[PDB]
């Protein structure tokens, strides 16, 4: 997906990417979820322009009634949360192993 800035790049690049099978073009001010997650599957490959990044900084402060959401988790790395000196220090000794030997 080609994301461009129509103010700084113009709309002539839309014509040159039209016939190439598969490639799509979208302005940075009118991004489409149907194109960013095709089929409901996340992770679309995107070629940006430089002006696309600068106006991508710009247009998320211009939406009225919307601010960029704050996550309920600060550090999403669970291995950093659990395997850290902070938590490992207060942990009681293990009560068993991953595999329990059969007693009788």
């Amino acid at each position: 997906l080609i994301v461009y800035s129509p103010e700084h790049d113009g709309k002539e690049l839309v014509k040159g990417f039209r016939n190439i099978p598969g490639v799509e073009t979208c302005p940075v001010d009118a991004l489409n979820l149907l194109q960013l997650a095709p089929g409901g599957h996340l992770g679309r490959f995107i070629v940006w322009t430089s002006a696309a990044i600068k106006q991508l900084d710009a247009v998320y402060e211009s939406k009225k009634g919307f601010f960029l959401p704050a996550n309920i988790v600060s550090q999403a790395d669970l291995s950093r949360l659990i395997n850290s000196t902070e938590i490992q220090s207060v942990l009681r000794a293990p009560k068993g192993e991953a595999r329990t030997k059969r007693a009788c």
């Binding site: 800035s5 700084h8 790049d9 991004l31 979820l33 960013l36 997650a37 599957h41 996340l42 992770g43 679309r44 490959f45 995107i46 070629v47 940006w48 322009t49 430089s50 002006a51 696309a52 990044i53 991508l56 998320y60 939406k63 009634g65 919307f66 960029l68 959401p69």
Partner: protein
Amino acid sequence: IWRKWHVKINQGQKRFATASALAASAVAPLLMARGHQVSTVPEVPLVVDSAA
């Protein structure tokens, strides 16, 4: 014909989904898990200069 064909979604939830999709697009394992051939792509948010 008076079946409900269209779905009203809150604009806040649509902007949340668009921002989540944009954030997911900057992660390369998600790009290959979606099915994109990016093994020769130098950086996942593939920024090219506007002069090109």
